[PDB]
Design a protein around this motif. Sequence first.
Motif, PDB file in Angstrom:
ATOM      1  N   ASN C 177       0.819  -1.201   0.000  1.00 46.51           N
ATOM      2  CA  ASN C 177       0.000   0.000   0.000  1.00 46.51           C
ATOM      3  C   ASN C 177       0.862   1.264   0.000  1.00 46.51           C
ATOM      4  O   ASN C 177       0.343   2.361   0.151  1.00 46.51           O
ATOM      5  CB  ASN C 177      -0.962   0.016   1.190  1.00 46.51           C
ATOM      6  CG  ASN C 177      -2.153  -0.896   0.980  1.00 46.51           C
ATOM      7  OD1 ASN C 177      -2.558  -1.175  -0.155  1.00 46.51           O
ATOM      8  ND2 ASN C 177      -2.716  -1.376   2.076  1.00 46.51           N
ATOM      9  N   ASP C 201       3.087   1.629 -12.613  1.00 42.74           N
ATOM     10  CA  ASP C 201       2.705   0.369 -12.003  1.00 42.74           C
ATOM     11  C   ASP C 201       1.770   0.572 -10.804  1.00 42.74           C
ATOM     12  O   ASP C 201       1.961  -0.018  -9.739  1.00 42.74           O
ATOM     13  CB  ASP C 201       3.945  -0.450 -11.643  1.00 42.74           C
ATOM     14  CG  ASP C 201       3.659  -1.941 -11.665  1.00 42.74           C
ATOM     15  OD1 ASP C 201       3.198  -2.436 -12.720  1.00 42.74           O
ATOM     16  OD2 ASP C 201       3.892  -2.587 -10.634  1.00 42.74           O
ATOM     17  N   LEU C 202       0.726   1.376 -11.007  1.00 36.29           N
ATOM     18  CA  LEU C 202      -0.322   1.544 -10.011  1.00 36.29           C
ATOM     19  C   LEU C 202      -1.603   0.896 -10.540  1.00 36.29           C
ATOM     20  O   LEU C 202      -1.679   0.548 -11.719  1.00 36.29           O
ATOM     21  CB  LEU C 202      -0.538   3.044  -9.759  1.00 36.29           C
ATOM     22  CG  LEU C 202       0.708   3.824  -9.354  1.00 36.29           C
ATOM     23  CD1 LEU C 202       0.365   5.280  -9.042  1.00 36.29           C
ATOM     24  CD2 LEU C 202       1.350   3.164  -8.148  1.00 36.29           C
ATOM     25  N   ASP C 203      -2.607   0.752  -9.655  1.00 40.85           N
ATOM     26  CA  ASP C 203      -3.962   0.410 -10.061  1.00 40.85           C
ATOM     27  C   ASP C 203      -4.626   1.673 -10.573  1.00 40.85           C
ATOM     28  O   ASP C 203      -4.724   2.679  -9.850  1.00 40.85           O
ATOM     29  CB  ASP C 203      -4.828  -0.112  -8.907  1.00 40.85           C
ATOM     30  CG  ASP C 203      -4.350  -1.427  -8.306  1.00 40.85           C
ATOM     31  OD1 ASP C 203      -3.571  -2.151  -8.979  1.00 40.85           O
ATOM     32  OD2 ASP C 203      -4.766  -1.725  -7.168  1.00 40.85           O
ATOM     33  N   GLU C 204      -5.077   1.580 -11.822  1.00 43.89           N
ATOM     34  CA  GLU C 204      -5.810   2.642 -12.474  1.00 43.89           C
ATOM     35  C   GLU C 204      -6.934   3.112 -11.555  1.00 43.89           C
ATOM     36  O   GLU C 204      -7.121   4.315 -11.385  1.00 43.89           O
ATOM     37  CB  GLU C 204      -6.343   2.169 -13.830  1.00 43.89           C
ATOM     38  CG  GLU C 204      -5.265   2.089 -14.899  1.00 43.89           C
ATOM     39  CD  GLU C 204      -5.797   1.651 -16.255  1.00 43.89           C
ATOM     40  OE1 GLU C 204      -6.934   1.172 -16.282  1.00 43.89           O
ATOM     41  OE2 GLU C 204      -5.077   1.782 -17.269  1.00 43.89           O
ATOM     42  N   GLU C 205      -7.642   2.145 -10.956  1.00 47.09           N
ATOM     43  CA  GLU C 205      -8.823   2.403 -10.139  1.00 47.09           C
ATOM     44  C   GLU C 205      -8.439   2.630  -8.680  1.00 47.09           C
ATOM     45  O   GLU C 205      -9.312   2.979  -7.885  1.00 47.09           O
ATOM     46  CB  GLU C 205      -9.770   1.193 -10.116  1.00 47.09           C
ATOM     47  CG  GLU C 205     -10.249   0.723 -11.479  1.00 47.09           C
ATOM     48  CD  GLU C 205     -11.241   1.652 -12.155  1.00 47.09           C
ATOM     49  OE1 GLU C 205     -10.823   2.758 -12.571  1.00 47.09           O
ATOM     50  OE2 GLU C 205     -12.435   1.265 -12.257  1.00 47.09           O
ATOM     51  N   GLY C 206      -7.172   2.345  -8.330  1.00 44.77           N
ATOM     52  CA  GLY C 206      -6.663   2.547  -6.983  1.00 44.77           C
ATOM     53  C   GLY C 206      -6.845   3.999  -6.556  1.00 44.77           C
ATOM     54  O   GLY C 206      -6.878   4.891  -7.401  1.00 44.77           O
ATOM     55  N   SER C 218      -6.529   9.026  -8.199  1.00 44.62           N
ATOM     56  CA  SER C 218      -6.583   7.680  -8.737  1.00 44.62           C
ATOM     57  C   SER C 218      -5.213   7.336  -9.324  1.00 44.62           C
ATOM     58  O   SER C 218      -4.446   8.216  -9.689  1.00 44.62           O
ATOM     59  CB  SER C 218      -7.713   7.529  -9.757  1.00 44.62           C
ATOM     60  OG  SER C 218      -7.449   8.314 -10.917  1.00 44.62           O
ATOM     61  N   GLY C 219      -4.904   6.052  -9.422  1.00 43.55           N
ATOM     62  CA  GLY C 219      -3.654   5.645 -10.031  1.00 43.55           C
ATOM     63  C   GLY C 219      -3.553   6.116 -11.479  1.00 43.55           C
ATOM     64  O   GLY C 219      -2.470   6.488 -11.928  1.00 43.55           O
ATOM     65  N   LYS C 245      -2.073   3.932  -0.633  1.00 42.81           N
ATOM     66  CA  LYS C 245      -3.224   3.382  -1.331  1.00 42.81           C
ATOM     67  C   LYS C 245      -4.302   3.075  -0.292  1.00 42.81           C
ATOM     68  O   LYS C 245      -4.004   2.427   0.706  1.00 42.81           O
ATOM     69  CB  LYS C 245      -2.801   2.084  -2.021  1.00 42.81           C
ATOM     70  CG  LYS C 245      -3.736   1.569  -3.104  1.00 42.81           C
ATOM     71  CD  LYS C 245      -3.348   0.163  -3.543  1.00 42.81           C
ATOM     72  CE  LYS C 245      -4.161  -0.384  -4.701  1.00 42.81           C
ATOM     73  NZ  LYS C 245      -5.564  -0.637  -4.300  1.00 42.81           N
TER      74      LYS C 245
END
Lengths: 721, 721, 246, 228
Positions: C177, C201-206, C218-219, C245
């Motif tokens: 996180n 390298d993140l979550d788009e929706e994170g 957001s990521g 996160k």
Amino acid sequence: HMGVRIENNLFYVESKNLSLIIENRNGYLLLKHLGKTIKNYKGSNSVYERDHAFSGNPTATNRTFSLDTQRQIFGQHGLGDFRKPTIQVQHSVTEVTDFRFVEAKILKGQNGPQGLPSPHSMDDTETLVLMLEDSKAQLSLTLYYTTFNNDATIASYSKLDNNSNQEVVIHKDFSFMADFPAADYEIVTLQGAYAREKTVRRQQVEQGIFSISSNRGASGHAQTPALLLCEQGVTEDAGNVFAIQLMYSGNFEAFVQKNQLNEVRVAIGINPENFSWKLAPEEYFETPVALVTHSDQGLTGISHESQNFVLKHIMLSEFSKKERPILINNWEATYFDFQREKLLELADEAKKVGIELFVLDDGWFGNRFDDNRALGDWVVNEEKLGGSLESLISAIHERGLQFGLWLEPEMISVDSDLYRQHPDWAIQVPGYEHTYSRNQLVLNLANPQVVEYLKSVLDQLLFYHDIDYIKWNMNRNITKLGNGLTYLETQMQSHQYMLGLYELVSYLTEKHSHILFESCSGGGGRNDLGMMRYFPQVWASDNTDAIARLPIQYGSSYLYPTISMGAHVSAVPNHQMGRMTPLETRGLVAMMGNLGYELDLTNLSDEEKATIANQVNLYKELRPVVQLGQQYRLINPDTVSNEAAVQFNYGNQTIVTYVRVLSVVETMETTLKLKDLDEEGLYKLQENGEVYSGAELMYAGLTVILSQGDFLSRQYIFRKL
Amino acid sequence: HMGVRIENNLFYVESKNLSLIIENRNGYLLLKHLGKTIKNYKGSNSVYERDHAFSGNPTATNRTFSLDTQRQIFGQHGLGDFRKPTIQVQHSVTEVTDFRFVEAKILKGQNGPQGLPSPHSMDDTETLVLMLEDSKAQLSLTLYYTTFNNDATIASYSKLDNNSNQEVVIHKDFSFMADFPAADYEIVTLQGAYAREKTVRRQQVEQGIFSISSNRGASGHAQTPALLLCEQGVTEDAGNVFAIQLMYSGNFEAFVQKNQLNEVRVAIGINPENFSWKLAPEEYFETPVALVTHSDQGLTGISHESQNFVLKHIMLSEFSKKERPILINNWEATYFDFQREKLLELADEAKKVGIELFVLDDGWFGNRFDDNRALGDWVVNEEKLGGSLESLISAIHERGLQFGLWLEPEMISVDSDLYRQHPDWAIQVPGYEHTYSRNQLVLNLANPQVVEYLKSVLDQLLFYHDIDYIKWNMNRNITKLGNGLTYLETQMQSHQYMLGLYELVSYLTEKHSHILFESCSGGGGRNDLGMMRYFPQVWASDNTDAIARLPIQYGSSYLYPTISMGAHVSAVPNHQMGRMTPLETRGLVAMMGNLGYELDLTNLSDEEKATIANQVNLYKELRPVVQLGQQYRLINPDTVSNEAAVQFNYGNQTIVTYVRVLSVVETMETTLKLKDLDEEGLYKLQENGEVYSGAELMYAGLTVILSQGDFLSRQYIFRKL
Amino acid sequence: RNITKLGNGLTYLETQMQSHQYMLGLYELVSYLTEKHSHILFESCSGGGGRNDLGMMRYFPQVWASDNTDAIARLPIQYGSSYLYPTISMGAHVSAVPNHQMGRMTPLETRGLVAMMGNLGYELDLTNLSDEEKATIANQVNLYKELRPVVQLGQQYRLINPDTVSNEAAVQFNYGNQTIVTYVRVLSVVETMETTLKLKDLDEEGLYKLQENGEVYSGAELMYAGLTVILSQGDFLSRQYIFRKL
Amino acid sequence: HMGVRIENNLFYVESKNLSLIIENRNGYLLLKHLGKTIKNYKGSNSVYERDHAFSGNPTATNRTFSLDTQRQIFGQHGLGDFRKPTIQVQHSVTEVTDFRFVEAKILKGQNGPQGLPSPHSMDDTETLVLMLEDSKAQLSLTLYYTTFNNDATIASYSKLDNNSNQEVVIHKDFSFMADFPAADYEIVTLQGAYAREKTVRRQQVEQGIFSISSNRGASGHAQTPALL
Ligand SMILES: OC[C@H]1O[C@H](OC[C@H]2O[C@H](O)[C@H](O)[C@@H](O)[C@@H]2O)[C@H](O)[C@@H](O)[C@H]1O
Ligand SMILES: OC[C@H]1O[C@H](OC[C@H]2O[C@H](O)[C@H](O)[C@@H](O)[C@@H]2O)[C@H](O)[C@@H](O)[C@H]1O
Ligand SMILES: OC[C@H]1O[C@H](OC[C@H]2O[C@H](O)[C@H](O)[C@@H](O)[C@@H]2O)[C@H](O)[C@@H](O)[C@H]1O
């Protein structure tokens, strides 16, 4: 042998080592050759006439002659040539012209457009006068090309006459154009930004169009009216360079167009943006002077050609070979917060260290306590100055110092008596709010009442006060064009503004020719050859950081002589960069230009004062070499270089300054070779007493040694024995 | 003034416009300067002595002197210098030496290693003799540097003497080394491949090591013994170039090493791969001659320096300025399938078209009906030749033609009487099968019986027959090294092979000096300065395609004079490329070299015969200009260029050949400028009778016009009036 | 130091063997000691980075990456030193100013942030520091205790490479996180638009909460729009963005 | 699926997302593919066998097979291949060897040279053992290639045995070699200097030879044992 020759259908314009050879082909003018001198030209490099698809023709039956494919010296649109045009005139229902050559004349001596800066010292010149006519439109276009016998430069400009019964409108009128044969080329320009002026850019010529331009009503910080078309692989020492430049300080454009066949057009002139020009019957228009300069000795060669021509034929004769005073300026030193006591204290200290001239900067007039008011009120603040300006000047004269003063004539603040009396003198659009810039507005110098007022106010200031030096600032760009009685008059007002400026400054520089005028525009915002016709030096940049200055001075002296290039030792941490640099380095960098000082000498330690006095002593010795001598770039400060080195030769004197930006470790020392010495000459290096032949210095060079640390510098001084 | 001077601790080696200045520093030799002439050298470019981490020292207390950081002229390993070594000798339990300078001498005139090709015409030279000793190992190393008064070249080589009581072994012994100061450099080399010889490669010098080398026992198709260290941004016309070359035809290496401090070492010599050299007490070893050549006029400048030196001091005096005969060769024309009738028919036709010399190629000896047998059996096949060789030769002489013959002396077929009589004469390893190449083996020329046999056989052939010309082929590389009685002798056999070759060819070229010898190795497999000491021309490539030839001739004449460069008009479709080219283009490309013909003239149309006779007529006129004149590359044929153009000047004659590879459309015609004319000279172009000043031809140039189509060419011929 | 004067063999061949035998002897020595004292952390060194290879790293789990402890000179060094080798191996110490190798003043913040892109230590006379400098160091030590797992155990992403032509360096680390990004600028610039720095390298929706301003991005925004990087005037300035996160 | 497989004359060394596929061609070992995983390899990228001039042959009558032109996993000098060699052994009067493949084995788990640092945590690895012999010289050369199931890495090393009655001398013995097909390549290395360690260098691959090396008895400040 040089000057102009007319031989059958060929016109030869012959400067020293540079020829323009033009052919009259049934009324069409063809560029046959531009480059090194050729006599008895036959046409080895003639365009081969063939049918090129979609390249059209003046007659039905000959598909092989096309203005799309002929190399030319001016460009029209609508006759089959689709390259960018350089003359375009509206008349009746069209903006098609067809100017045809009718007659050539040759002039000798002084010659130039009225009301625009042009070359001087023209006794030994000749001018080709190519008279063209559009008989249907009843317009004349006259092209002028001037030779110089002592420089590889040709100057050009044109005159458009309306010989018809109706109003006509000029939409495009460049000052110079050339069609160059398909080959690989590079271009060099000077661009950059405020506090980053004249950044040298080099790139490959590619299909399509590249341009630099100003639409700011001044040439601008971010582009210089210059474009160098270079042979692929040009170096400092070798290759062909053609520099086209413009003697104009307003809106300009330079472009390079590589068309469908790989042909290349270059041109420079007044920007089409923000320009139209109405001509009533019998009226005429003359364009600013353009220059074409040539070298086959690479970028140092073109620097030298350009500097020489500027020194001999543009910069005022009164100053072009005159050592310039080492000055103090209080701007960075005090800003607006000063009074008589502080000024004379600063003067005392300047005198102690051997400074020659004292410049009182912004804040002496009206209620100018900050930069939010008072522009336009050129009235001495006797309270702030603790008495009359006359009184301050005598005080300064008595201390052994020449006296200089800052003006910003072209500007008006909303909060000023001037604006209160004449709100309509501002450049503005009826029914639109002002656009502001440094909380000030621009005076409409297209209004003859504005020019007459500024002549009067300034004449009064200069005659009633013993002023030795003027610094002429201009601190914003032009917005909100709308002062015309018609749209066309508004479209004229940016060039008329320039004509008004040139009328104003030529008048004052002429009627007060003993005064040294330094041009300024937030530093280098208007550092061009138009201004340098009248102002023999220029505040090259507000960036007074010693390291940030390296690329700035590289650019600022690229085409212009070092003597023009104001450079001041300033305080640390530096006010623009937030940086500590050695006082030695600030000294040595500023001494590669026209030296002054701009820091509070009253607040320095005893040691720093001593150092400054030593620098002043050194520069008094180095001044002729730097200002009058020949400049040779040895290591260029760019984006990738960690170094800068510049040499100056002047008779028996040779100096080299070296600066390193970042400290390095476990890196072999640079070898630095000198240029343009006598192989057999004997050169005694001041620091170690050693005598080196010129061959050794040029072919072996100097191992450059430095301690650990950033922004260190050194100077090598040589006497030829 | 030129030659050698010893002044205190400095040694000056002074050729025309090139100096090597060496300092003796307590027994260590330092390279102070290599470049343009400097007298009274003081040391502006001396290395600054500091403590560099991990750079070690000869004494405990002085950390600032390190052979890791000093610039030198020869390299050792194990004394603190970690750069690649150029001398390395095993003795006792170590291969550490420490050669220290003990004494210098100066020789005048002829001087060179025994048994290896070296410069001639040395009356006006002087040689610096630097005598070094390792007193513990009891070895002497002697360095020689030779000046030339008429060329910017210095030659070098060394002699290692074993003055000890035990056997010692040489592991590395290069012929030349130089430590150059940190700066930006590029390197040019000639690489490529069979049928792609001498491809010009240019790249940036990068940290680490770059090398070219041969381990093939010949210099090889894919690398030439040459390396040009160039100033960043060098062009054809400008910049500093240093060319290091080797007079050796065996295994070699050239390397460039950029070390941790950005310093740069270059060296050339015998490859360490496949080399060791045993020295018994009192025995000595001498390395091949290396050359260092300099120009400050770019790549054309170094081409000219290199060509001149080769012409005057390497190529046999008997031929270096002698026009070479236009020949016919039957190889591509018939391969192995011919007989007396065919040969004399070919000769008749060659005579008709004005060919001067007739070369009988492979297939005349033993039972050589294909390329699978008979090498080693240098016995005339009287059945195939329809009588004695004497008889064929007279037949050829009577037809007005000189006579030439193909040999391949260094080779033996398994299927041959020679191999049947002496299987042990092949290079081979006991108990390993042969490695085959073109189904043939290599004779062990390290075996003195092999050399004596080849001297005898060939002397017999040349004395008993009226031969005017020899073509000396060598058609594979060396595998299976194992003929020594010990490992060390095998490690010696590749260099001994070379010594045997040089003994053989120097003997024959000397005892038959009227004969023109052309070297060959499947074309350009061994085209180096070792061979060119004895063979004044070389079959530049088996690729006889006119277009494929462009880059090949570019490379093949880069450092070597055009006169050396065999080029033959051949048949279409071309046998290597599978390509149709115009006969005009095959003519014009071959005429940029040393012209011959290699196609079946008996099978040509009447028209093609006529064309060839016209080409022969043309070349008789152009021969002095091409072979004796000065070459100027105008457009280089490379990977990205669609063009080639080469100019030759010779007194009042100037020719330019232009070739375009691919057809183009809607592309402006090339402008082609000539070089090195008199500006004021008047040049009459043969095709149109027009007279152009040299200025026009150089500064405006020629619009080059061609029809549609691939591989078109043209020639412009000029007479200076 | 490096090896000179090879001549200890009883024969030439034995001398030609002794450099590899030296290595075998080294490996015998160090494997023995590292094995018989496996609780001890061994750091390899050779005037800094003179022998920083995978042979040594079999036995020595960290290495003194360089004697150059200058924060700015360290940028290209750490770029190279962690190119193939994990960050955990890469010794980096906050040192004194002026720096002893480069002769340079750098902000203590920058020396901290550069050293925290590696395996953090200190190498200066803490007894001679002001009260303020001590406080700053204690704050850096507090920060790194938090950042240590992310830097040493997490995944490294180079965002801007420090080379010969770049005026910048930026390196990101992800660890569950936690997402951190360090940015350094070498030379002060003027009238130059601010860099846009995009994360990887993140979550788009994170949803990523930036510690300094509390803002949640957001990521996708951080990866595709990126951060306007803002700095004062001056040389060798740095900053760190820390993300949780949610 | 990962590890080592022997299928007719092909050897597959399969790590996670990385395969080395080797063909035994009459005792000669050919590098068929090194890269992303391929199962049921057929030979789309096989070298086309032709007569290349001056590229020689093991037999008299076949000009199209040459060790000068075959892609390989170890290099010898003197058999017609003129590229830089990676194994070179003196024995008797020569340093020509001709190692021919005789037999392959597969190991599982821990495996490495004695006395030299080698991978650990090898429970899930397999090692291809390619046993070569020079029967005339009576030498064995054994090549090892190890798979990793959790990483796109293969490890290699070799063992040279002297099975003869005389002393022999190794002159060259590299740990890994690969012949890659003609294409445009760049190389990255870590070089630099003391106080400038591991400077990332990037350049174009050019005809000829580029190298980094240490002769300092340590790997050194100025070069790292890496080449990309
Ligand atoms: O006001 C006097 C000043 O005028 C010009 O500089 C204007 C600039 O001055 C400061 O740097 C300010 O921060 C900037 O925003 C402004 O553009 C002139 O070039 C200076 O020399 C000085 O005379
Ligand atoms: O055999 C005579 C021949 O020798 C040399 O060329 C050898 C090459 O000839 C053919 O091109 C053949 O296809 C190639 O494989 C072989 O290498 C020499 O250079 C030729 O001129 C010719 O004399
Ligand atoms: O001696 C302890 C020291 O050892 C290593 O550094 C050696 C270097 O130290 C100094 O920088 C000196 O000026 C250099 O010449 C010398 O090479 C080690 O890497 C250091 O950490 C330190 O332990």
